[PDB]
Amino acid sequence: XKXX
Amino acid sequence: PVLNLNDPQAVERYEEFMRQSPYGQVTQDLGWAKVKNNWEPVDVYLEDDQGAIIAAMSMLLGDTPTDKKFAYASKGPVMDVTDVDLLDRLVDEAVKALDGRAYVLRFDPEVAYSDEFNTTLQDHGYVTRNRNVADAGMHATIQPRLNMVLDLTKFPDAKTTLDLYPSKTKSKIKRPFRDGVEVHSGNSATELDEFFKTYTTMAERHGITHRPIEYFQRMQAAFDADTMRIFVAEREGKLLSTGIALKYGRKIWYMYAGSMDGNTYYAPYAVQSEMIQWALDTNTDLYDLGGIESESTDDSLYVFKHVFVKDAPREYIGEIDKVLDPEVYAELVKD
Ligand SMILES: [Mg+2]
Ligand SMILES: [Mg+2]
Ligand SMILES: [Mg+2]
Numbered sequence: 241x242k243x244x
Numbered sequence: 245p246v247l248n249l250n251d252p253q254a255v256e257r258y259e260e261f262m263r264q265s266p267y268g269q270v271t272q273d274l275g276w277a278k279v280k281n282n283w284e285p286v287d288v289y290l291e292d293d294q295g296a297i298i299a300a301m302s303m304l305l306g307d308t309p310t311d312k313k314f315a316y317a318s319k320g321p322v323m324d325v326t327d328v329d330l331l332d333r334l335v336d337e338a339v340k341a342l343d344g345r346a347y348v349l350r351f352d353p354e355v356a357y358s359d360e361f362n363t364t365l366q367d368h369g370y371v372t373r374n375r376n377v378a379d380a381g382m383h384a385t386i387q388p389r390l391n392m393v394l395d396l397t398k399f400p401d402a403k404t405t406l407d408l409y410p411s412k413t414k415s416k417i418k419r420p421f422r423d424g425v426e427v428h429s430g431n432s433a434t435e436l437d438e439f440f441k442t443y444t445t446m447a448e449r450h451g452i453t454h455r456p457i458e459y460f461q462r463m464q465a466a467f468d469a470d471t472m473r474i475f476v477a478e479r480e481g482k483l484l485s486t487g488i489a490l491k492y493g494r495k496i497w498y499m500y501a502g503s504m505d506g507n508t509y510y511a512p513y514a515v516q517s518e519m520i521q522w523a524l525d526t527n528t529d530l531y532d533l534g535g536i537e538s539e540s541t542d543d544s545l546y547v548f549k550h551v552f553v554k555d556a557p558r559e560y561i562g563e564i565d566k567v568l569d570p571e572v573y574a575e576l577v578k579d
Contacts, residue, residue, distance in 0.1 A: 241452055241453060242386075243387065243388075243499075243534070243535070244499045244500055
């Protein structure tokens with residue numbers, strides 16, 4: 241950045 | 245038992261349980277290991293007396309600055325995790341397969357936070373991370389715990405996106421289309437290239453990182469066009485915004501977005517509308533717009549998502565940690  | 249990833253029949257049987265389970269999650273599919281190919285996959289399951297799978301946990305193991313790995317089952321395991329005596333059993337199989345290599349097994353299922361479930365998990369020896377650790381930073385949770393999920397089963401007769409919404413929101417959604425925004429969708433390399441242009445533009449405009457295009461290529465190779473779909477909004481041949489959604493289990497999940505700079509003619513609302521229409525057209529129970537920081541007008545993720553989800557955000561239990569090497573856990577994990 242996040243995630244996925 | 246542990247899944248032998250080299251036995252295609254065993255692999256397919258595990259995939260069948262995962263794709264048909266009400267608790268299925270795309271991040272517990274084995275395809276997710278293909279996307280996160282820099283992690284090591286270890287997958288376990290339990291069976292019933294007839295030898296059918298009843299519960300499964302897909303883990304990925306990542307490095308740390310210690311001699312131990314971090315074992316993470318993202319949004320798993322796949323079962324009713326409130327059945328804690330079955331979960332303990334499943335976790336014991338997982339711990340056996342990790343064979344002392346990991347310092348923790350963490351899982352973050354999509355099940356509602358409650359004090360009684362928190363307390364039950366702690367009484368079973370797990371360390372939980374939720375209300376005790378709220379914030380943003382090296383110590384917050386990997387997945388957001390507050391998420392904006394539209395429950396489409398509240399609207400059993402809805403035919404189109406606009407049927408789910410009050411007139412003031414029907415006007416918000418109609419606007420980009422009235423202004424000539426058009427959405428196409430698919431899962432080819434051409435939609436991926438559109439997405440990736442909008443994704444790297446947005447990331448440059450916010451001064452943030454983005455994943456390399458190979459990650460999404462891996463995703464497109466692991467998931468077909470009935471699971472993974474990229475929606476591309478344009479107006480009179482000009483690219484405006486895009487989003488990627490994954491349909492799996494009982495939900496379609498809006499997972500990635502991008503947008504060009506300047507005037508986008510409310511194209512992101514058109515992309516949502518079309519994602520929503522795919523959830524209606526496939527009779528999918530939930531449409532998930534993903535995380536927020538706080539249920540507050542000050543939170544811009546919340547502001548946008550709340551157009552589409554008028555109900556309370558869902559608040560999940562958070563991180564459940566089976567601590568395996570306590571010394572390393574304490575070094576790496578603080579509130
Ligand atoms: Mg290391
Ligand atoms: Mg329908
Ligand atoms: Mg709503």
